[PDB]
Amino acid sequence: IIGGTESKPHSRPYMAYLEIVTSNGPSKFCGGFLIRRNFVLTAAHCAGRSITVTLGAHNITEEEDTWQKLEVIKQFRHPKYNTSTLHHDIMLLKLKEKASLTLAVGTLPFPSQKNFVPPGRMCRVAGWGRTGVLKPGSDTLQEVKLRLMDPQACSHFRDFDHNLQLCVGNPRKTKSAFKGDSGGPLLCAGVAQGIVSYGRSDAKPPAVFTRISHYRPWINQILQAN
Ligand SMILES: COC(=O)NCc1c(C(=O)O)n(Cc2cccc3ccccc23)c2ccc(F)cc12
Ligand SMILES: [Zn+2]
């Protein structure tokens, strides 16, 4: 998160910290959010050989009783995810066991409505990602308020698609999701509407988020069958 604030500790109890393991490199990290006691939603590009989820975290360097470190049994990457275009950048993680409900850990279920979100309004995104181009991931959960932009603002991303994705962040501000914030939720009036997907290496906003509304049928299908 660039140009944001430190979250009030445990104020976003659905937030998930993902450690992603691959065979031929060190750990990578993503965000995500708990939508059921045993399901986390994140980005498809956060897939790996194995993943561990930590719920209940604020400062991810300091172990505390709120932590729940949870095993992932299965990854459900969107079947049409494309590594070239980055279309359909969404994935569900099934946890081995159901998480405990505490003050610090809870679900963020979707409302019944899945209305298309138009440009204009302010939304908020959170994560443990880099706080600048040359800075490292944040030890503490950070968050920032960003503007939903008209789709033409993301035209320079040649594979951007308004039906599939949100265009997020006023180009006149530094404020942005960035590297390390992958998979984290964009909340608009308390409702998850986007997932951090990709942007520019130089951090100039806007960035591209998965439009959750488009994938509500697919999400429902996985949750009902597993
Ligand atoms: C768990 O594996 C990773 O994290 N891999 C690295 C990786 C990242 C990142 O470092 O998070 N992002 C988000 C991203 C990359 C650049 C500028 C951005 C600008 C804004 C927002 C996100 C941005 C990706 C997107 C697509 C992709 F195939 C790989 C990545
Ligand atoms: Zn605490």
| Domains, in order of start, for the chain | 1-12+108-213 (2.40.10.10), 13-107+214-226 (2.40.10.10)
Distance of CA 166 to the CA centre of its chain: 13
| In contact, 109 and 49? CB cutoff 8 Å | no
Minimal-distance CA residue to ligand 1 atom 6: 179
Alpha-carbon distance of 124 to 118, in angstroms, equals 15
Minimal-distance CA residue to ligand 1 atom 24: 198
Alpha-carbon distance of 60 to 62, in angstroms, equals 6
Decide whether any atom of ligand 1 lies within 6 Å of the 14 Cβ. no
Positions of E strands within 78-217 = 91-95, 122-127, 142-147, 165-168, 185-188, 191-198, 207-211
Phi, psi of 221 (to 5 degrees): -65, -45
For the chain, state the CA radius of gyration.
Answer: 16
* Distance (Å) from CA 55 to ligand 1 centroid: 22
* Distance (Å) from CA 46 to ligand 2 centroid: 26
* Distance (Å) from CA 179 to ligand 1 centroid: 5
CA distances from 86 to 16, 76, 93, 129, 152 (A): 22, 16, 19, 20, 18
Alpha-carbon distance of 11 to 160, in angstroms, equals 32
Alpha-carbon distance of 207 to 209, in angstroms, equals 7
Minimal-distance CA residue to ligand 1 atom 1: 46
